[PDB]
Amino acid sequence: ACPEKCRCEGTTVDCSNQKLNKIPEHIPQYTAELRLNNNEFTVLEATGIFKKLPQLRKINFSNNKITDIEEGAFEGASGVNEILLTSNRLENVQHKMFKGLESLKTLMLRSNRITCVGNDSFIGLSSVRLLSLYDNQITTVAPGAFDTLHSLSTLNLLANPFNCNCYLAWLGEWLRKKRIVTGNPRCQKPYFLKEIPIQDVAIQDFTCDD
Numbered sequence: 001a002c003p004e005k006c007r008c009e010g011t012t013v014d015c016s017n018q019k020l021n022k023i024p025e026h027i028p029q030y031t032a033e034l035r036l037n038n039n040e041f042t043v044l045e046a047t048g049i050f051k052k053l054p055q056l057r058k059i060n061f062s063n064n065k066i067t068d069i070e071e072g073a074f075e076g077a078s079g080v081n082e083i084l085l086t087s088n089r090l091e092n093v094q095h096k097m098f099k100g101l102e103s104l105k106t107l108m109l110r111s112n113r114i115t116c117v118g119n120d121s122f123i124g125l126s127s128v129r130l131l132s133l134y135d136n137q138i139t140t141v142a143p144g145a146f147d148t149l150h151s152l153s154t155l156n157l158l159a160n161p162f163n164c165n166c167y168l169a170w171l172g173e174w175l176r177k178k179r180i181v182t183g184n185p186r187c188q189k190p191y192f193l194k195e196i197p198i199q200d201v202a203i204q205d206f207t208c209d210d
């Protein structure tokens with residue numbers, strides 16, 4: 001039976017535009033797509049309702065105002081292929097956020113507020129083949145931040161204020177060596193390299209200034 005604020009058409013449970021804080025009460029066991037987008041979520045809490053939703057393959061959190069995800073917001077979600085977090089307020093990532101997503105193939109993180117990627121912001125997501133970081137606020141990327149992601153084929157870096165200082169030298173190399181679609185991200189600082197693709201800059205000009 002359909003949860004109160006939602007709409008249940010086939011195997012999709014739609015809980016769009018409902019001014020919602022918390023995931024609705026009795027999500028039917030059969031469900032395959034849970035839509036939570038366009039609500040007002042602030043923080044995703046540890047839930048374990050995903051433990052008994054073995055059919056769920058997609059979850060939509062687009063267009064909320066999520067600042068944090070607690071470890072185990074996704075406990076037992078071994079089935080899901082894609083979670084959409086596009087348009088939210090995440091300020092960074094930690095693998096802890098995604099404990100439980102054993103099969104995740106798609107992670108949309110587009111249009112959040114992530115200021116940097118960590119040497120293990122994405123540890124353990126060995127199955128994702130598309131990760132979008134488009135339109136965030138990323139300044140650098142620690143070395144090997146991506147080495148973990150063995151399945152990765154499309155990584156959208158575009159629309160971030162990359163600082164091409166000595167700290168981002170390595171990303172240049174990585175980009176030109178890993179045959180992986182990125183869109184061709186461009187340097188935003190320092191002034192003399194603005195709007196030049198990262199991968200293009202000579203090893204000599206990455207020079208964080210003393």
Ligand SMILES: *[C@@H]1O[C@H](CO)[C@@H](O)[C@H](O)[C@H]1NC(C)=O
Pocket residue numbers: 119120
């Ligand atoms: C990145 O390298 C390892 C691998 O995850 C990690 O333990 C370490 O904290 C990171 N390096 C530094 C210097 O923070």
